[PDB]
Design a protein around this ligand. Structure first.
Ligand code: NI
Ligand code: NI
Ligand code: NI
Ligand code: NI
Ligand code: NI
Length: 278
């Protein structure tokens, strides 16, 4: 009962409704959760807060996002492994074990890549209609939030913080969904697209002078110690418009940094943006 999945790192033969599924992308995991697909293995060490249910002992622990337990994955003998960018370089190692499908977000085409990802899950697991229905809800959600976005001028800047350090994201970056999809005008639409982004300090923020500053506290999740407010709210930033109108929006990093590209995380992500401009 096979299908063949063409993805960014190859073509994979997969049995439909595969019995034992190992997942290394949290967008995918949150997608399968939404669709009521049972997974077998997850990297429990990096599980986002909203996916804490996958710590349960009924799930196998296949290590961490960056440190797969390849011996264990072998012991499990899965019918399907699903990976994303973080594990792109280990594709071969996973493919040697079991059918490995790679799933990424093309950040020039966030929504299209997102939709194809979900539809592919729809095919593997027989959830085409379910997936469609959820994609349509996120379509509506997007429309509503665009309408509000276009009922104001106001320019957003999106930043990330690791321990003091600060960096910048714009159209077609990992966080560019704010601009590219949700109708928020950028402060700067020429930022370097890396996926840890152009580095900046506090003089760039002040002079660009954003009305909304969206922040993602990396060290909250990755170090286990939240540190973003301490860093961002200081003299050098405190008299931008954003600070004043109380429009520094601290985006939940468990969706924005750890996960995303999933039914739940994308829906949830769009929600934090809506409220941040309500
Ligand atoms: Ni082990
Ligand atoms: Ni073992
Ligand atoms: Ni090779
Ligand atoms: Ni439809
Ligand atoms: Ni509301």
């Amino acid at each position: 009962e096979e299908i063949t999945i063409k993805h960014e790192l190859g073509e994979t033969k997969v049995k439909k409704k595969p019995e034992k599924v190992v997942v290394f992308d949290f967008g995918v995991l949150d997608s399968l959760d939404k669709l009521g697909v049972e997974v077998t293995g997850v990297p429990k060490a990096n599980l986002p807060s909203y996916l804490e249910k996958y710590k349960d002992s009924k799930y196998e622990n296949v290590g961490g996002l960056m440190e797969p337990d390849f011996e264990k994955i072998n012991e499990i003998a899965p019918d399907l492994i699903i990976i994303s960018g973080r594990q792109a370089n280990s594709y071969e190692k996973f493919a040697e074990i079991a059918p490995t499908v790679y799933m990424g977000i093309d950040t020039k085409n966030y929504i299209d890549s997102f939709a194809n990802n979900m539809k592919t899950l729809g095919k593997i697991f027989g959830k085409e209609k379910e997936v469609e229905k959820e994609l349509e809800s996120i379509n509506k959600q997007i429309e509503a939030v665009k309408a509000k976005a276009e009922k104001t001028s106001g320019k957003a800047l999106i930043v990330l913080t690791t321990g003091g350090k600060v960096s910048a994201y714009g159209p077609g970056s990992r966080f560019g969904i704010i601009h590219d999809v949700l109708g928020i005008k950028p402060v700067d639409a020429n930022i370097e697209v890396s996926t840890h982004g152009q580095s900046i300090s506090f003089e760039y923020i002040a002079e660009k002078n954003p009305d909304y500053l969206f922040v993602v506290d990396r060290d909250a999740v990755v170090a286990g110690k939240p540190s973003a407010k301490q860093t961002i709210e200081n003299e050098l930033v405190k008299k931008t418009n954003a600070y004043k109108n109380n429009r520094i929006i601290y985006l939940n990093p468990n969706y924005w940094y750890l996960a995303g590209g999933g039914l739940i995380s994308v829906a949830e992500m769009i929600n934090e943006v809506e409220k941040g401009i309500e």
